Amino acid sequence: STQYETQGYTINNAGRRLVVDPITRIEGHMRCEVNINDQNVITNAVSCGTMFRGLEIILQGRDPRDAWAFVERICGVCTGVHALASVYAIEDAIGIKVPDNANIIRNIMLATLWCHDHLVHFYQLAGMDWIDVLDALKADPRKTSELAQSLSSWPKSSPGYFFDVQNRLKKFVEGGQLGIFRNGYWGHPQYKLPPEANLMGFAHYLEALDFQREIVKIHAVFGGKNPHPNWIVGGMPCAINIDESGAVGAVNMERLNLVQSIITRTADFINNVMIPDALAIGQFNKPWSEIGTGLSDKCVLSYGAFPDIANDFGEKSLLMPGGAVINGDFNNVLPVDLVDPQQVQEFVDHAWYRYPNDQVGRHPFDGITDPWYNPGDVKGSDTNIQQLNEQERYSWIKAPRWRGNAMEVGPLARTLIAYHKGDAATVESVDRMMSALNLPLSGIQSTLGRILCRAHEAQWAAGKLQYFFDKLMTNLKNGNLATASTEKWEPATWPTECRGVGFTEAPRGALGHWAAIRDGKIDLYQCVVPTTWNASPRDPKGQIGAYEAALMNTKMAIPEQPLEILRTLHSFDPCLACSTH
Amino acid sequence: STQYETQGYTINNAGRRLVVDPITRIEGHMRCEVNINDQNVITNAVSCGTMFRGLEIILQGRDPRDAWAFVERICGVCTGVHALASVYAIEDAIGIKVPDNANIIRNIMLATLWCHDHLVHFYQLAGMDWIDVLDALKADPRKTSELAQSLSSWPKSSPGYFFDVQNRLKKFVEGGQLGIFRNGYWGHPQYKLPPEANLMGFAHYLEALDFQREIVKIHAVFGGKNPHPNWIVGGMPCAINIDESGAVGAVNMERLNLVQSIITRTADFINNVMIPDALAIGQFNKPWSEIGTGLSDKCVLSYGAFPDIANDFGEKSLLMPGGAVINGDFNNVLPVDLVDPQQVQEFVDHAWYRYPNDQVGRHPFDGITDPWYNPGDVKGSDTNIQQLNEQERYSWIKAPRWRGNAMEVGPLARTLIAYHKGDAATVESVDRMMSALNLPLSGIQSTLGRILCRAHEAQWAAGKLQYFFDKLMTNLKNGNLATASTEKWEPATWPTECRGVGFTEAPRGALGHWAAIRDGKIDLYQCVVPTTWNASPRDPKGQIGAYEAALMNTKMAIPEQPLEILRTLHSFDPCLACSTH
Amino acid sequence: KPRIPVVWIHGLECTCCTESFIRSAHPLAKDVILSLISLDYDDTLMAAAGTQAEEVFEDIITQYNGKYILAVEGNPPLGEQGMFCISSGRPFIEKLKRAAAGASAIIAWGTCASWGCVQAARPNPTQATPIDKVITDKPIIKVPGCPPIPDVMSAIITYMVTFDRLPDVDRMGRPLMFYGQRIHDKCYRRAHFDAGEFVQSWDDDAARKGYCLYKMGCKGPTTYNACSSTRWNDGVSFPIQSGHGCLGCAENGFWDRGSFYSR
Amino acid sequence: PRIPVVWIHGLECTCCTESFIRSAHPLAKDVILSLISLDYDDTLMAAAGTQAEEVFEDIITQYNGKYILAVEGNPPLGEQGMFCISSGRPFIEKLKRAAAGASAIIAWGTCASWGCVQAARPNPTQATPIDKVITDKPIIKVPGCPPIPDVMSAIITYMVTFDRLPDVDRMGRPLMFYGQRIHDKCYRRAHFDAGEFVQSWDDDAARKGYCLYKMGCKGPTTYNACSSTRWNDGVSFPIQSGHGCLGCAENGFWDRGSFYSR
Numbered sequence A, B: 001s002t003q004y005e006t007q008g009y010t011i012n013n014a015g016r017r018l019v020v021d022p023i024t025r026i027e028g029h030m031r032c033e034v035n036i037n038d039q040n041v042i043t044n045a046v047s048c049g050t051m052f053r054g055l056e057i058i059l060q061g062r063d064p065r066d067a068w069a070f071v072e073r074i075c076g077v078c079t080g081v082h083a084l085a086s087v088y089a090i091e092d093a094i095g096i097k098v099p100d101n102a103n104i105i106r107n108i109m110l111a112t113l114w115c116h117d118h119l120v121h122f123y124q125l126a127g128m129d130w131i132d133v134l135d136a137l138k139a140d141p142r143k144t145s146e147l148a149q150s151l152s153s154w155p156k157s158s159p160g161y162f163f164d165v166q167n168r169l170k171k172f173v174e175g176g177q178l179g180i181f182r183n184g185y186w187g188h189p190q191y192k193l194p195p196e197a198n199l200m201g202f203a204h205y206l207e208a209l210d211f212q213r214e215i216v217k218i219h220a221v222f223g224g225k226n227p228h229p230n231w232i233v234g235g236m237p238c239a240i241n242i243d244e245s246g247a248v249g250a251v252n253m254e255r256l257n258l259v260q261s262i263i264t265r266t267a268d269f270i271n272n273v274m275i276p277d278a279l280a281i282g283q284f285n286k287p288w289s290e291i292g293t294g295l296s297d298k299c300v301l302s303y304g305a306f307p308d309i310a311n312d313f314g315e316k317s318l319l320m321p322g323g324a325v326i327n328g329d330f331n332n333v334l335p336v337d338l339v340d341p342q343q344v345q346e347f348v349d350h351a352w353y354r355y356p357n358d359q360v361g362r363h364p365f366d367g368i369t370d371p372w373y374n375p376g377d378v379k380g381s382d383t384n385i386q387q388l389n390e391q392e393r394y395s396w397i398k399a400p401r402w403r404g405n406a407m408e409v410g411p412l413a414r415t416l417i418a419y420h421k422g423d424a425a426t427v428e429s430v431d432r433m434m435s436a437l438n439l440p441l442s443g444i445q446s447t448l449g450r451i452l453c454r455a456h457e458a459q460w461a462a463g464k465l466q467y468f469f470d471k472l473m474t475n476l477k478n479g480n481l482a483t484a485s486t487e488k489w490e491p492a493t494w495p496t497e498c499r500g501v502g503f504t505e506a507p508r509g510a511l512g513h514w515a516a517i518r519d520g521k522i523d524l525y526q527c528v529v530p531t532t533w534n535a536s537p538r539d540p541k542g543q544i545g546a547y548e549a550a551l552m553n554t555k556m557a558i559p560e561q562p563l564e565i566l567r568t569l570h571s572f573d574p575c576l577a578c579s580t581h
Numbered sequence C: 001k002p003r004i005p006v007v008w009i010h011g012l013e014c015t016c017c018t019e020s021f022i023r024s025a026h027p028l029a030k031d032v033i034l035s036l037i038s039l040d041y042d043d044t045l046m047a048a049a050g051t052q053a054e055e056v057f058e059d060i061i062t063q064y065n066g067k068y069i070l071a072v073e074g075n076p077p078l079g080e081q082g083m084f085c086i087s088s089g090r091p092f093i094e095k096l097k098r099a100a101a102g103a104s105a106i107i108a109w110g111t112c113a114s115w116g117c118v119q120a121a122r123p124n125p126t127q128a129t130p131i132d133k134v135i136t137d138k139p140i141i142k143v144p145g146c147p148p149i150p151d152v153m154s155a156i157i158t159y160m161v162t163f164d165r166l167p168d169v170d171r172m173g174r175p176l177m178f179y180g181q182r183i184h185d186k187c188y189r190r191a192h193f194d195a196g197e198f199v200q201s202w203d204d205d206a207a208r209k210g211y212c213l214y215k216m217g218c219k220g221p222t223t224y225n226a227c228s229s230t231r232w233n234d235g236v237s238f239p240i241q242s243g244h245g246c247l248g249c250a251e252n253g254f255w256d257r258g259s260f261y262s263r
Numbered sequence D: 001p002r003i004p005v006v007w008i009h010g011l012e013c014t015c016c017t018e019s020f021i022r023s024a025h026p027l028a029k030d031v032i033l034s035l036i037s038l039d040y041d042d043t044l045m046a047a048a049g050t051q052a053e054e055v056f057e058d059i060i061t062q063y064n065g066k067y068i069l070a071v072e073g074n075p076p077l078g079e080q081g082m083f084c085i086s087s088g089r090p091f092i093e094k095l096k097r098a099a100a101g102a103s104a105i106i107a108w109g110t111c112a113s114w115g116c117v118q119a120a121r122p123n124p125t126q127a128t129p130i131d132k133v134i135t136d137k138p139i140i141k142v143p144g145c146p147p148i149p150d151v152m153s154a155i156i157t158y159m160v161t162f163d164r165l166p167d168v169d170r171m172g173r174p175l176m177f178y179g180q181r182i183h184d185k186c187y188r189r190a191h192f193d194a195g196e197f198v199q200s201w202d203d204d205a206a207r208k209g210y211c212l213y214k215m216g217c218k219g220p221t222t223y224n225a226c227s228s229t230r231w232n233d234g235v236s237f238p239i240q241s242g243h244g245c246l247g248c249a250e251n252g253f254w255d256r257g258s259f260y261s262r
């Protein structure tokens, strides 16, 4: 057993080893291992992506116009975000400028995704870490009504409603078929909600499972379907016709009316169900504002997103700020350049990939994706891993670094970047939110903080949805209908050789696609995805990524039941298919 | 002036005349006049249908297969019921038996209509006679929540919800554009709800206006569209395919699943919003259990509806009982025969039609529709009527009688017939309803009782909806998919001369279509419609119809403000386009 | 900020057009009434009756003279000096003329107001007449169908409110947006028409596979509406999808174009 | 008691789970609480790690011969199957163990049915559809990337209500939803018949809803319910919103040339 120091942590693989495989209530396949000391405190944490598909290999030789459709299938949870990054990358490479309405509709597609994804994460993925569903059976329906009405104006609060929800759960359990609730962590001492808050939470779990289906109707109108809507290089294919023959065949006033109706309902659900629930989880779990800090007080990264000026990806255009903090210096938000070879690099010394020199990091334009399953000296065998060997290669996830630094990405990262750049809305949201909880600002740099920032981002995005929709309608009032530029649709118009970067802020953090086009075909296509950053394995210096760092130093009440590990991992919203692609 | 006695009333047209033209919050065109004595008591009531189109004339010479589509347009409120009566009539004439699934789907269409129509009537048509909308602005939102939660399990009851509803109304009226509320009877002393009940009722008005649109999705599945779904002679055109190629082109499992979802939501809304509101109006307006009795304690009529044994229209088949009561003898539910020339007859001595002898009544197989606009000695002129002359012809509505008796039809009539035939479910519903208000059973025979029975019936119909759907699914499980009989689709297969009766219970009461076919064409087509009964003018003996009787002896607080007249008329749910056709 | 005044009147009708309107899924009819327009007169929905209702009618057309939209459901009869439809003791046609004189524009809802619909079918006992044969000095937007699609009715209203103009129309005064193309030119069963794959009798194998309804009398090839694209009742169905041919209900005189089951 | 369902996940993007929870009728909520017993599902279940595998093992033992196995994604044969690792072992082992006790298997999506995107050239992981690995069990293929939400739920309700598997075409796809081509129920077919085609994006044709054949629409060779049942509670489908069908329900659609070519 060895010990070394990195980023303020003492990585120590003495003591009991615990394995959580599978990690559930995530997208895709993850394994996590830890070592705990004699006080049941984590002294070593190992993040492992347990899947790979090889989209970067598959994309070679494809028509650049087709690329979005392939890379969209990196992920059905963050569905659309990879299509957006792809059309951005291809447009950047060829030099295509899209019409304003295409840009606005793309922003609507992204905002819609932020709302949907964040909502489903809060309830269906992270929720059962905080809500003791089975304890809801002990709640008083009237006291549940009282609690709900104390927290929100949301209509659905009657005693009889909560009784009906409770009764439905009771009869469900009575069947002796607990389904998705079977063999959970119910009764664990870290469940702190009173029964009434558990019943309220569970009711909201169900309401959110229902409501989330409506949000993506916006994707259906502009993009055909959800999951996996359609896009084009040059804009969007959803041609607009308001006042001419054949408007029945296009985005018309009736289609726009449907979109408006969904926007209003989406804002209302998020503002009156999710936001109060997140604050309530905060109130009953304040100690988790001091757990799972990880890299969030050290190194955070955002590329920025939502260009409000069409075809302008600069700081004055992006509504979601970009920037990097390193060394815990939040007074110096540094600019990010995705073409600079000394900035974003990926290492594979601790990953299942071949490089000519695994001691160096490769910028994505020099990226290599050559799979090499070699887990080394595991406890077990190559096909029966009892314990990964984190001293060697232990993941299908590459290790991204920014100027050699290990970074956290995602809602909390974005909140901290915007806050420290002096975004007024963000400072106000964060101050008021932490005030309501009677916690210091530093409490946001935590597992609880990740959850609170995500919730607030859903509110932010629901607001932006209306703003974008209103900008679309303003263009239509002015007779500006264009949704595609076709000037450079034909391969004959393209440079023989060119390369481009497409970047955005996906629900889980900073996303980039790096594309090289040669002779009308994809020559290279490299993706670095938010969960790649967060779930990263170690690098040649032994530096740990965001997950490993957040898990370090964490107390477990009951080693056999990994509730604390789940809480922290889930707070990052892991997307493993994304991470590996 | 003149005075005479009929049916226990003293009809006296001395004294002040009041005119209400238009009657609003009904379907179509009605005028009502009354005389009031100096005690502000009605001593004379005059019901006038102020429209005519002449479908019975238009149908002559048409193909019997087309008839349903024409007569469906008698009414867009009771949409579908005329098409049902039409296909029944033509099938009876020709001798066609439809397959079970066609019968079950027709029963689903009828039950759907009962649910929808009754809901809209309660809230959008009758509601504002009982709910003081402007008084809702004075409610306390918390006390409103507490009232709603005391009455119902319905979820949407939070103080914040009622505050938001109240604030929407506040903003609506703040601009001084009161729209449909302008120049209302608000503040009238007969408005008895407290502010909290007004706000609860107004909230439910809005919820019902939204929700009603959902119910008719069942019509859209089986019948293409609502209003005015499609039908065929021989069954229904909505071919079923569950498990074969091309199910995408038919009624398939996805389509049936949509229907099921709508059924459950419909039952929920009716049982948890409309039923408790009907009882709440009952609790605050108990004197109206003694007002507007009219013919409801004398003569009531149902043909019966919802044949559960396909093509059997007998007593063992109809789920909604048929029968007639006369002379207040509720122990003698008499059988109704729609072919008997001595039973159903229409008189026109006081209507704008020509008969060879206007002192006799004509059975519909001998019916005549020869319009004759002759208001005789009005106050005013033929084109500017200040006062109708009820001693002469005063309506576009014919006067139906049953064995010479003036009858009331509709939800209260049906409730009475089923109650006195010993239908267990009706007896229990009525007993429980009247028990809940601490009222005698006789209290159902009233204006309030018509509203309470209509709400009951919506609940009954929602339950039957599920029953019929279950029967359809039972057939499909057994491989019984048939929806049409076509062996007598071709005119050449029909009798050279034949006649048929199609009958049902529309939302407003007993409906009959009498059709004669000759040489492949409609020879005669006569309709007698529920509002024809209820809104009937007088007959040669001077006997008054249901509306006129209900209005007799009514106290008015403020002669110039017809709130009491509207309450009673609205309780019968007038459909004037129906009445006149 | 004040909402556009709308006066909604009713001639000879079945009220299918009001009923369609309140079906609107987006915007909800509730929201149209509360937030988008000011529905200032409408006999079917208004609290006031009789003299109270006619005071509203008279106040609105006076106070907003030249500034309201007139929506007409149903149509005026010319027979019996107009007294086939009596409004406040007078022929409806007089109320229609008075209402029309103050209107900035008129919406003719449905086949009734547009063309005549069922009451005008042979032999037209009441001499029911479409609005544009009575009112000849005002813009009339025809929105035909029996009734029109709910979400078409509300979309035309949102167009007027959002863009502050009437929809552009075809030569018959129908909004191009929804009536520019035929049912048959956007029908999901067109592949079957093209292949000669037809329902020949009800509930035959073709019917169970969703084949074309041409041989069963479908009038989609001569009917202009949005039913095969926008569809009905929040996108749930339309006549053809549920197995009945188009009757032609959006077209002038469709009742008298022969049997619905003939070519 | 509700029918036991075991839902496993191979190499995937999770689009099929996401589609399922979009179901409008019945709601996914009601499928889980009332129609089936969703007894195992990594994406949604409370239990993780050893607790989750305790459920997996007990379910497939207790209900041996009586559970439905739903499969999302597929097994890779490359690197001894360790391109997809499940509780430290190749996914394909978990698939075989789950398959052996199943009464029947649902192959959700193009992944489980055919291969989908990871199987597109050059198929780095040797991703393989379920029916090439499990050869002794009924497999219902429900293709599409993903399949339509209300088709997924409709197939479930069929199995519950009728107590049988849907009848299938020669490829194992339910006839009810896959018996006809997108192009045979496409509302733009009138335009195809008339030679009325979009020729470039956002042209006059595109703004009138003309046919997308010349823009590469693969509807003529694709079997699915998108042009009839439509997507997301009957709101739209690819063609309606202006993009040609990609062919996403068909075996090998990724490698059938550019989406924009014939």
Ligand code: SF4
Binding pocket: C183, C184, C187, C188, C189, C190, C191, C193, C211, C212, C213, C214, C218, C219, C220, C221, C240, C245, C246
């Ligand atoms: S069903 Fe009617 S509208 Fe559709 S293709 Fe056939 S004939 Fe044309």
Ligand code: SF4
Binding pocket: D182, D183, D184, D186, D187, D188, D189, D190, D192, D210, D211, D212, D213, D217, D218, D219, D220, D239, D244, D245
């Ligand atoms: S859009 Fe595609 S599926 Fe539709 S008609 Fe044209 S080619 Fe066929």
Ligand code: FCO
Binding pocket: A075, A078, A081, A082, A506, A507, A508, A509, A511, A529, A530, A531, A532, A574, A575, A578, A579
């Ligand atoms: N959000 C998201 Fe998916 C991840 N990680 C992407 O990009």
Ligand code: FCO
Binding pocket: B075, B078, B081, B082, B506, B507, B508, B509, B511, B529, B530, B531, B532, B574, B575, B578, B579
């Ligand atoms: N209900 C109804 Fe209409 C009337 N009266 C019919 O029939």
Ligand code: SF3
Binding pocket: B073, B076, C013, C014, C015, C016, C017, C018, C073, C074, C109, C110, C111, C112, C113, C117, C118, C145, C146, C147, C148
């Ligand atoms: Fe629509 S009121 Fe009904 S009849 Fe044909 S439109 Fe008229």
Ligand code: SF3
Binding pocket: A073, A076, D012, D013, D014, D015, D016, D017, D072, D073, D108, D109, D110, D111, D112, D116, D117, D144, D145, D146
């Ligand atoms: Fe549907 S998991 Fe998403 S990739 Fe195509 S189906 Fe697979």
Ligand code: F3S
Binding pocket: B225, C145, C146, C183, C223, C224, C225, C227, C228, C238, C239, C240, C245, C246, C247, C248, C249, C250
């Ligand atoms: S009958 Fe009418 S509703 Fe549409 S499909 Fe034909 S125009």
Ligand code: F3S
Binding pocket: A225, D144, D145, D182, D222, D223, D224, D226, D227, D237, D238, D239, D244, D245, D246, D247, D248, D249
């Ligand atoms: S791309 Fe797929 S979703 Fe349907 S329309 Fe084509 S099969």
Ligand SMILES: [Cl-]
Binding pocket: A330, A416, A441, A442
């Ligand atoms: Cl900070």
Ligand SMILES: [Cl-]
Binding pocket: C008, C009, C010, C011, C043, C087, C095
């Ligand atoms: Cl009027």
Ligand SMILES: [Cl-]
Binding pocket: C111, C115, C116, C117, C118, C120, C251, C252, C253, C254, C255
């Ligand atoms: Cl006409």
Ligand SMILES: [Cl-]
Binding pocket: D007, D008, D009, D010, D042, D086, D094
């Ligand atoms: Cl699995």
Ligand SMILES: [Cl-]
Binding pocket: D110, D114, D115, D116, D117, D119, D250, D251, D252, D253, D254
């Ligand atoms: Cl494939």
Ligand SMILES: [Mg+2]
Binding pocket: A056, A398, A526, A527, A528, A529, A581
């Ligand atoms: Mg990569």
Ligand SMILES: [Mg+2]
Binding pocket: B056, B398, B526, B527, B528, B529, B581
């Ligand atoms: Mg008659």
Ligand code: NI
Binding pocket: A027, A074, A075, A076, A077, A078, A079, A575, A576, A577, A578
């Ligand atoms: Ni993802």
